[PDB]
Design a protein around this nucleic acid. Structure first.
Lengths: 129, 82, 141, 126, 80, 100, 203, 223
RNA sequence: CCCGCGGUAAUUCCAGCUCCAAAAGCGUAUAUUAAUGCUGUUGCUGUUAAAGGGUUCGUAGUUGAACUGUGGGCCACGUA
RNA sequence: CCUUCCUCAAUCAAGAACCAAAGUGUGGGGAUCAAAGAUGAUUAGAGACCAUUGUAGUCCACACUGCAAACCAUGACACCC
RNA sequence: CUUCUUCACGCGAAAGCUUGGAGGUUACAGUCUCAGGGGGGAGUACGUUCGCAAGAGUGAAACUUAAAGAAAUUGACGGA
């Protein structure tokens, strides 16, 4: 099938923005996804979400507004350390100044700009702008 | 379209329509019922989906048939629900 | 996509979302044991018991009614089945199918159907061994 | 092609259009008319106009022929708009408290704060 | 927007799609600006309009009515 | 360049992998049933007065057919169609949309 | 008002003109503002909305500095008189029948006007105009029936428009309120004007 | 006319010295048609009004390679707005001139940017965005105050006429196909107001018809 | 170079003159580097322009979901 | 279907198992349609179209084969519109 | 299985493109895989391996050349 639901979720999410599906109940979360969702939410892109139970992997109800321009996942994940921060960002943000790149860290799942600010490398997840 | 509502909450239309494993959460669609054989003053727990049989044990015989969907109750067997 | 079929078999029973059975009546582990055994002594395959039970006993979801799944109980309770039953079900056909095939002339279907199953038979067994409950050094033939 | 050219038709028309009514159905005076109410060029063209003017009138004479008029009818219609007191197509209506649909009565009821009515659809029927 | 010193810098602080709020560009010819005149008791007071400029797309989508209809729900006019 | 999608065959979506070829009764190279148009019709007999002659001489009654009539199961394809001023490029879109 | 909820008389009017039962027994439920598959090619169209829309129509109508620059349209025979009757009264700019474009697609044809707005009534028939609205950032309110497409009419007036008084009544009725606002017509007016002259064609 | 009546009311209002700025169109959501409106509105000296492309157009036709000229005018002024023209004519100049009007007409607001972050003022694209066309691909990328910039000569002239200096380029495609190239460019230029900014945006407060703000005035000296 | 000049009133040939370009360097060759995301991790392609097999199984190969990772509490105040 | 069972999978070189026509061997098989051929006719030529037949084939038993504009010229699997 | 109304932007050079199209991608990135990579020479060669046998499988360089292609468009034309 496909594995990274997070990833399915991004393409799909994107579409959701794009034609304006303003809430989704996604099927069916892990620990991971959420941390990431939160970041965007922290960053004024979508509204807020709410995690639904299931007895098997959760569903989450997601608030959006119209602020996302693009959200990616990178398969594969990749190390991050110094310069590579420059390159990724340059690669994917319409200008270096807005958007976030997210990698997965020791310090938690985290954006690169902040990461740049935290001064820790780790592995790369994706990005949103 | 998708405004007034909630996907999260359905309402008065809106449960009836969702299908089985896309009921927001699936849930045993079938259910159980209580059935009585006029055969005796004693009665039986039943599946509304059964694939096999009920025997009355007020007299060993079967009140329903396996058939795919809801199983076929028959014979003046009376049932109520949970 | 479906592993012998272009179309889709959704089918399904929908699990008791409620794990707290059942909005009308509790039973004891003793009961369930009692039942099980009685049935198991009655000889269904456990899965088959389960099915059977589901209507026949008209008491549901084995995993709930004592916080288990039949097979382990049975196992522990010395009423394990001989084998990995799905592999069996497939086998019993397969066997049958070889027999049929033996009768037959030309039937490509029995070949096709046999293939898939036997393979499957392999997968599963390879799997049982993978889960160390194939008997080691084991195969179907 | 005894098609009255565009120019023609336009002209024969136009002369009644600017020079309302009068005429004949006779070509002959309508002819003279053609001479007289225009300052046209060739005779043929006037006559042809005329022939049609006779013509157009001849069927105007029996109607407001496709696309054509004299403006009175209009001022009758205008004066016929006026059916008001000779019609109340309103309260001809046979019931103030009404024989009608349930919910519609119901939205109305909640809207009409608990007011007491029988709530019944138009039938039940599709 | 704001420049290195802060400060708006550069022309035309854009429009935005007063429903979806998607940006409004400069070549939207199905976008519209409704200033909708407020009622008072018996009337309307005007000067007071609820005003929107809304993009084209929705007009394509049946949500020119509809979406605005929700939007308008979110801004109620004559309601129950 | 390509001119008509299904290219006659009415089976791509469905299930009819390959389907019934026929000699087309008018030319007779062998062809599949859905690349030939069909309009299996009954068919009329006699002119008016030859019928009148036959009508007076109609010592013939009812049975579900009060004087009977023919029936031609007609199936045309390129081969014969053509000459018979039968089937060709209409205007565009009708090359995709069915009779009423 | 305060209060803007329908009266039994209003109700009387509405059902009377016969605007309220749908087209085809089901219809485009993209316009799912019905609730009720109703016999013989209709539905119930839920009125409530209709109303809510209508008054809104006014709330925006009442903005226009130049009410003439509120542009009315009607290809249905059953609408012209009416549109005028609204127009005469409002000063609208009206559009009967076959539109013929270049109108604001051309500013160089005589036609040229440049209102804020256009109100359409047979979306369907009235496509050029829609198209025109679509050219020029114009919205279009509209008398819509239940399968009357609504694309690029913004603000639907759920509306059975089967001729007679249906259309006209609706239009007239509509008017009454706008008039209450801009215009000063008080409510327990008659509102003088009648569908009888809103009406249509004769004889 | 040289005394072009700006028969639009806008062009009127405009000619009539109320609201002479593009932005007022863009802002107010306005569209145009009348070419003089801009030409009126902004015309201060040199603006950077230009002809660019000069093409022959043919319809082959029996007794005729029916030949016509297509010509491209780019109109711009050195910060924020560009105005595009391609037009065809049976005379070359006429095509230019036809293109001129289109050029006037096809004016767009340019949200410029910088790169890295703001400096005293933008001079870049504010984003990295793309124009695609038949066989064309450019994506125009943020650079800073001293760039010679990747890619094509061809738009570059325009860019200059619209007011930016430094942006990165990645050009991909059939440069081969220059007509389209410009079309792509324009398009690109059009997305010079694309992307939901996090960078001003906030809320756009209403701004009511500056046209219909003078409705009566527009209905005066005018019906 | 390649597009092409040239059968005479040739724009590219012949000479002249004039001009031009770069320049004390410049022609040339061959190769090689980019242009080429025109081999592509970034970044190609494969319905009609090259390209997805007639069909399936299938070890190799790759790829492979969730879940028990988590912080918490309290206080202070300021504080939107 | 409230059955059991806990990732069981996915897709996949090699590698296997299939592949219409037709052919191909070993046997049916006989009727027809008809490759081969034969006849006409035609043509400028024409052993080609066209005709009139007619031999192999055809169906089949039985083998074997691998080639078929073997076309949803559109790998699969995925999740959406 | 649709057809397919009809709609979707979208995607596309178009032609055209649904179930969950050739859509949701140079704002280039779910997996796995096959293939493809000017044209011609040749899919051929005693090249080589299956295969009874066809021939399949596998598979070139030399030599050659500036195009070849594609869709649309208009035109022209037709023993249409």
């Amino acid at each position: 099938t496909m594995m990274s639901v997070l990833a399915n979720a991004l393409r799909c999410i994107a579409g959701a923005e794009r034609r304006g599906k303003r809430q989704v109940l996604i099927r069916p979360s892990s620990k991971v996804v959420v941390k990431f969702l939160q970041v965007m939410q922290k960053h004024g892109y979508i509204g807020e979400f709410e995690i639904v139970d299931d007895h098997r992997a959760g569903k989450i109800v997601v608030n959006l507004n119209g602020r996302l321009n693009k959200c990616g996942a990178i398969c594969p994940r990749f190390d991050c350390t110094a310069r590579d921060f420059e390159k990724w960002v340059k690669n994917i943000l319409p200008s270096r100044q807005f958007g976030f790149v997210v990698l997965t860290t020791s310090l938690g799942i985290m954006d690169h700009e902040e990461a740049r600010a935290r001064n820790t490398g780790g592995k790369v997840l994706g990005f949103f702008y | 379209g998708f405004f007034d509502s909630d996907l999260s909450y359905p309402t008065v239309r809106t449960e009836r329509m969702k299908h089985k494993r896309r009921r927001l959460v699936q849930g045993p669609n079938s259910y159980f019922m209580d059935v009585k054989c006029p055969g005796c003053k004693n009665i039986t727990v039943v599946y509304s989906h059964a694939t096999s049989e009920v025997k009355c044990n007020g007299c060993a015989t079967l009140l329903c048939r396996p058939t795919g969907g809801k199983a076929m109750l028959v014979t003046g067997c009376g049932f109520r629900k949970k | 996509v479906r592993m012998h079929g272009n179309g889709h078999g959704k089918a399904a029973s929908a699990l008791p979302y409620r794990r707290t059975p059942p909005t009308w009546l509790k039973s004891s582990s003793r009961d369930v044991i009692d039942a099980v055994c009685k049935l198991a002594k009655k000889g269904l395959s456990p899965s088959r018991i389960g099915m059977q039970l589901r209507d026949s006993m008209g008491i549901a979801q084995v995993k709930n009614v004592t916080g288990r799944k039949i097979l382990r109980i049975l196992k522990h309770k010395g009423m394990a089945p001989e084998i990995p039953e799905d592999l069996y079900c497939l086998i019993k056909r397969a066997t049958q199918m070889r027999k049929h095939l033996e009768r037959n002339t030309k039937d490509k279907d029995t070949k096709f159907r046999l293939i898939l199953v036997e393979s499957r038979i392999h997968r599963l067994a390879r799997y049982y061994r993978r889960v160390k409950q194939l008997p080691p050094t084991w195969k179907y033939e | 092609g005894k098609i009255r050219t565009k120019t023609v038709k336009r002209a024969s028309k136009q002369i009644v259009e600017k020079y309302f009514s009068k005429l004949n159905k006779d070509f002959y005076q309508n002819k003279r008319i053609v001479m007289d109410v225009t300052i046209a060029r060739s005779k043929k063209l006037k006559n042809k106009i005329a022939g049609y003017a006779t013509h157009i009138m001849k069927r105007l004479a029996r109607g407001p022929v496709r696309g054509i008029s004299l403006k009175l009818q209009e001022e009758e219609r205008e004066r016929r708009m006026d059916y008001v007191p000779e019609v109340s197509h309103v309260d001809q209506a046979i019931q103030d408290g009404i024989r009608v649909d349930k919910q519609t009565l119901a939205m109305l009821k909640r809207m009409e704060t608990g007011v007491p009515r029988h709530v019944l659809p138009n039938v039940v029927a599709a | 927007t704001y420049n290195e010193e802060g400060v708006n810098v550069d022309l035309y602080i854009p429009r935005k799609c007063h429903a979806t709020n998607s940006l409004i560009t400069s070549f939207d010819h199905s976008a519209v600006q409704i200033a909708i005149a407020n009622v008072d008791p018996n009337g309307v007071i005007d000067g007071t309009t609820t005003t929107l400029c809304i993009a084209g797309y929705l007009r394509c989508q049946g949500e020119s009515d509809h979406a605005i209809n929700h939007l308008a729900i979110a801004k109620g006019i004559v309601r129950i | 360049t390509t001119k008509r999608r299904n290219h006659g065959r009415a089976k791509p979506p469905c299930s009819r992998g390959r389907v019934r070829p026929v000699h087309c009764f008018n030319c007779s190279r062998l062809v599949p049933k859905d690349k030939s148009v069909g309009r299996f019709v009954v068919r009329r007999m006699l002119d008016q007065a030859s019928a009148r002659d036959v009508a007076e001489a109609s010592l013939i009654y009812g049975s579900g057919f009060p004087m009977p009539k023919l029936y031609m199961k007609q199936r045309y394809c390129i081969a014969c169609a053509i000459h018979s001023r039968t089937v060709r490029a209409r205007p565009v879109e009708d090359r995709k949309r069915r009779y009423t | 008002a305060k209060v803007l909820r329908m009266k039994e008389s209003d109700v009387q009017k509405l059902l009377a003109m016969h605007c309220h039962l749908g087209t085809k027994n089901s219809s485009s439920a993209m316009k799912k503002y019905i609730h009720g598959r109703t016999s013989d090619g209709t539905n119930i169209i839920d009125i409530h909305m209709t109303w809510e829309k209508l008054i809104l129509a006014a709330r925006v109508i009442a903005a226009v500095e130049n009410p003439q620059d509120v542009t009315v349209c009607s290809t249905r025979l059953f609408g012209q008189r009416a549109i005028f009757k609204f127009s005469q009264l409002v000063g609208t700019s009206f559009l009967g029948g076959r539109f013929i474009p270049g109108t604001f697609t051309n500013q160089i044809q005589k036609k040229f006007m440049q209102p804020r707005v256009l109100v359409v009534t047979d979306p369907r028939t009235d496509h050029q105009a829609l198209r025109e609205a679509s050219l020029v950032n114009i919205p279009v309110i509209a008398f819509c029936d239940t399968d009357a497409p609504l694309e690029f009419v913004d603000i639907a007036i759920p509306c059975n428009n089967r001729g007679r008084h249906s259309i006209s009544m609706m239009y007239w009725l509509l008017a009454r309120e706008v008039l209450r606002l801009r215009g000063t017509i008080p409510r327990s007016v008659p509102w003088e004007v009648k569908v009888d002259l809103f009406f249509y064609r004769d004889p | 006319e040289k005394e072009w009546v700006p028969c639009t009311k806008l062009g009127r209002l405009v000619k009539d010295q109320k609201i002479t700025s593009l932005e007022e169109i863009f802002l107010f959501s306005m569209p145009i048609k009348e070419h003089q409106i801009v030409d009126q509105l902004i015309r201060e000296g040199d603006l950077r009004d230009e002809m660019m492309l000069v093409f022959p157009v043919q319809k082959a036709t029996s007794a005729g390679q029916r030949t016509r000229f297509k010509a491209f005018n780019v109109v711009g002024d050195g910060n924020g707005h560009i105005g595009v023209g391609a037009r065809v004519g049976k005379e070359v100049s006429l095509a230019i001139r036809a293109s001129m009007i289109a050029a006037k007409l096809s004016i767009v607001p340019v949200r410029r940017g910088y790169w890295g972050n703001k400096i005293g003022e933008p001079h870049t694209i504010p984003i990295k965005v793309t124009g695609k066309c038949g066989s064309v691909a450019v994506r125009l990328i943020p650079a800073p105050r001293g760039a010679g910039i990747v890619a094509a000569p061809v738009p570059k002239k325009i860019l200059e006429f619209a007011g930016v200096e430094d942006v990165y380029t990645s050009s991909c495609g059939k440069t081969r196909t220059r007509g389209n190239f410009i079309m792509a460019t324009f398009y690109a230029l059009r997305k010079t107001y694309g992307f939901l900014t996090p960078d001003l945006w906030a809320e756009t407060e209403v701004s009511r018809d500056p046209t219909d703000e003078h409705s009566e005035f527009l209905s005066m000296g005018r019906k």
